[PDB]
Write a protein that binds this ligand. Structure first.
Ligand SMILES: NCCc1ccc(O)c(O)c1
Length: 373
């Protein structure tokens, strides 16, 4: 049925982010950090144009064979080249599983109201993956061994792939009934660009904040190392709550208004992080940041599907490749550019710049109220 497709997409995204986040703490044991995101950004539009040619089931199932190969390559690698190869393979997989899975979800839940909350649930998949990533990784790392986290995650990826092969049955190539509108015509749409830009700036704010916040906490607050890991918890829990609630709330409120308010709340929250003196001062603003990132993503993915349905041809592979490029731009240029700006003009000014950009971008979501057909 359809809820099994939703579960498959949720599980793919959850395992993808659990791997992406267990790799972080164990990696130490610069380019490697941005490698996955940039390779996924490169191979997003290709998958977008491919799902319209072979269908959704096959490029979503290749996303389990690529993520499984990446996972096992992480557990038995020592060299730096091999870790880079593993992270690039994870990037290609994630591209396959995010783009093809969101396309499948939009193709199956073909109703504007239902698509909202199923996108919300699939997105909360990423929050549940990031949130349960580090603890699982650590406990399995030290209580069993250094190859343990990745081999157990590989077993989980295999079980998810078994569910995939039993639900989707990717045996045969099935092209779409109608040829989807080209990628350039989509990219010339002022509304698809506004949606992608709102997702891009929200996630770039959060992706520049995550790595820059610990480097500032150890300098201003004299925080211990456990504090650095705990100070970012409100973001993930709040993103989980925000996505799961606003998938259902945004269509009653209006997706344009939910996106506008999410942008303004991300802006204000990020403008209000540098004013915190102690760790208890980074609970409320980080909560606001994560809550509003969810408020924006759970409102702007269904809108992507809707904007394609209303104006262009009903093929969702490319437009969700565009949405996933907007996602990945932030996580690719986040660490590097954020560290560069913080190393040059400081962390408070970086946060003020990001907040100003988000607040000034917010009024552009007004143009999503009633776009013409
Ligand atoms: N679209 C995902 C945004 C997100 C959510 C939680 C996080 O912890 C994070 O770093 C990023």
């Amino acid at each position: 049925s359809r809820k099994l497709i939703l579960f498959i997409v949720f599980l793919a995204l959850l395992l993808d982010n659990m791997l992406l986040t267990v790799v972080v703490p164990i990696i130490p044991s610069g380019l490697l950090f941005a490698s996955k995101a940039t390779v996924q950004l490169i191979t997003n539009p290709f998958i977008g144009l491919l799902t319209n040619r072979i269908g959704y089931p096959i490029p979503i199932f290749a996303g389990f064979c690529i993520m499984f190969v990446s996972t096992i390559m992480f557990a038995f690698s020592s060299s730096y080249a091999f870790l880079l190869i593993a992270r690039s393979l994870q990037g290609i997989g994630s591209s396959c599983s995010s783009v093809a899975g969101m396309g499948m979800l939009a193709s199956v839940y073909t109703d504007d109201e239902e698509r909202g909350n199923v996108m919300g649930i699939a997105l909360g998949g990423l929050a549940m993956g990031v949130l349960v990533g580090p603890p699982f990784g650590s406990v399995l790392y030290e209580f069993v061994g250094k190859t343990a986290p990745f081999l157990v995650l590989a077993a989980l990826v295999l079980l998810d792939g078994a569910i995939q092969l039993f639900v989707l049955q990717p045996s045969r190539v099935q092209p779409e009934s109608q040829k989807g509108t080209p990628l350039t015509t989509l990219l010339k749409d002022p509304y698809i660009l506004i949606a992608a830009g709102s997702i891009c700036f929200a996630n770039m704010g959060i992706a520049m904040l995550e790595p820059a916040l610990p480097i500032w906490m150890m300098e201003t607050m004299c925080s211990r190392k456990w504090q650095l890991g705990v100070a970012f918890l409100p973001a993930s829990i709040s993103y989980l709550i925000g996505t799961n609630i606003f998938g259902i709330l945004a269509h009653k409120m209006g997706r344009w208004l939910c996106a506008l308010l999410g942008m303004i709340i991300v802006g204000v929250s990020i403008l209000c992080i540098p004013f915190a003196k102690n760790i208890y001062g980074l609970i409320a603003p980080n909560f606001g940041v994560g809550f509003a990132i969810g408020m924006v993503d759970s409102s702007m993915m269904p809108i992507m599907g809707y904007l394609v349905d209303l104006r262009h041809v009903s093929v969702y592979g490319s437009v969700y490749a565009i949405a996933d490029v907007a996602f990945c731009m932030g996580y690719a240029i986040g660490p590097s550019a954020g560290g560069a700006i913080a190393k040059a003009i400081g962390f408070p000014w970086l946060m003020t710049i990001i907040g100003i950009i988000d607040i000034l971008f917010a009024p552009l979501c007004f143009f999503l109220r009633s776009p013409p057909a």
